[PDB]
């Protein structure tokens, strides 16, 4: 009987150098490049470099038929290539698509890279025509999202919207409709764009329509840090490095768990009630999304991640404090959570 | 700022050989051994061997503080060790815990191995004392599960139950209660054991209580192939190799998708209506559980896995046939699915 696919060991990751880098770009619709330092001589450093290269090789096999290419650039041997491509972040992945470059800041794993690059392949704007499509849009909550109403694909204002969408692709989905019925239900005027903050129910309309590309981009940059934001593998390092005053409020909640779900609903209520507070950005971590970090978290924070948790983490030393909750009692209310956070953050 | 944990490149996987294998077993509560053939000389074969060893090294780092050890046994250099440990399946993982051995038959990835070994560490029987625990039990559906009512931990019949639980651990959860209130709600008499087939609402009681270990084990072996079974990474190879007459009925459905959820409910209804048919065992695949195989599946089967699918697959050549469904129409009913399956399987 034929067996499942397996890693075949055939090398597909290109050693990108001065002589071939121009041809590599022409070959691939989407190109992922690991800009890396030369591996040190010690055995441990060699293993680390070995691990990353094989993760890329596995991703390259999976996406070979999709036209996604993978390459490596040595900061020393290929220093000239790095300069003309803008590769500055040491030991980091850069993703190239047409005229856009993405400095990847997420989990370095085959699963997350493949899912991410598959999303990169998609067009930057999703059209809403059917009712299923509209329902799918309305059910998104863990991403910021935008929806605009335009006359048709040839509208000057749609093209500006599409150009702005490319700047945040694929992290922030941009949706569009040309159908006056859909716009009516969304309460969109022609050329109007609504921004739906993650986990918020009410949108914010971009002012001064019709909107240029620059007006859209600047608005999204100002609103992309949501009051409640989910730690996602594709962007985990960016989220964590985006601390306010050197601390994060961190909430663990397993969405599929009855207690985790209830706690998440309370977190959303807290976020909703403080949405315009710029000094607040709670990170929600679903431990099911990070199975390899659960032991580390339980040891480091001395908590049981089979139950909801909320705490404050100092990003310098990983020192933390976590709210006590009794399993035999009902979970804390939104008022109780805000009260506890005020106590901790005062001192 | 302190960064997330990373693979540190330190070797933790033990080269198990005649001289040390006895000490390795004493050191670890749970021991995972890769029984492997000597790597061939070609570059591709070396990469494949390289990949697997580093997957184990990553798992070993994550579970180092949990007391889970990892080792490798060479079928030739360590042939003597393989014999006394019962290592027969070439290039396969064996998991040792106390007096029990598990021939792993699941996905060879760090994520799946770590999750699996964490489950192995847990005790084989889960006691139901609180209401949350009872609700958690009742909400399990994608696993076969057992629940028994016993006087206390010192009951001869509880110990027989616990001994049987070890044989299927951690694939089939065994639950127990000593509380007459819980037993009352479950409709369990003392020493009675109910088996809940995956996705079925009504349990089957093991006959002839009180039950010996052998009676429980034999009953579970006879009932573990459920009418609807989910492809799980931890056991995907066992499920797929357990075909009936050289074909599988395969259903793709994304549980979090509105159409996928509805289709899954229909599959459960089909299974329920044919539960006592031993010639039927539908495999449900949630494509979100296997992101690295979605491109392969879409290419091989010529289907769009963003929509539910049902088909028949020949396990010899991967030849298949898939039911046509119009997105603009309501999904097929249970009667329509059974009708289509009858048509395909007749010819
Ligand atoms: Ca290079
Ligand atoms: Ca996205
Ligand atoms: Ca409006
Ligand atoms: Ca304007
Ligand atoms: Ca806000
Ligand atoms: Ca060995
Ligand atoms: Ca299990
Ligand atoms: Ca009963
Ligand atoms: Ca008996
Ligand atoms: Ca059945």
Numbering used by the authors:
A (entry chain A), B (entry chain A): 3 to 349
Kindly provide excerpts from the paper associated with this entry:
To investigate any structural significance/role of glycans or structural change due to the presence of glycans, the crystal structures for both native and recombinant bovine Casq1, which correspond to the glycosylated and nonglycosylated form, respectively, were determined under the same condition. Calsequestrin crystallized in two forms: the low-Ca2+ forms of native and recombinant bovine Casq1 crystallized in the absence of added Ca2+ in the crystallization buffer; the high-Ca2+ forms crystallized in the presence of 2.5 mM Ca2+ (17× molar excess of Ca2+ added to solution). Low-Ca2+ native bovine Casq1 crystallized in the P1 space group and contained four molecules in the unit cell; the resolution of its diffraction data was 2.74 Å, whereas low-Ca2+ recombinant bovine Casq1 crystallized in the C2221 space group and contained one molecule in the asymmetric unit, with a resolution of 1.88 Å. Each monomer in the low-Ca2+ structures of both native and recombinant Casq1 contained five Ca2+ ions, while the three monomers in the high-Ca2+ asymmetric units contained a total of 38 Ca2+ ions.
Casq binds Ca2+ with a capacity roughly equivalent to a half of its total negative charge and an overall dissociation constant of ~1 mM. We also showed that both glycosylation and phosphorylation alter the physical characteristics of Casq substantially, including its oligomerization and Ca2+-binding capacity.
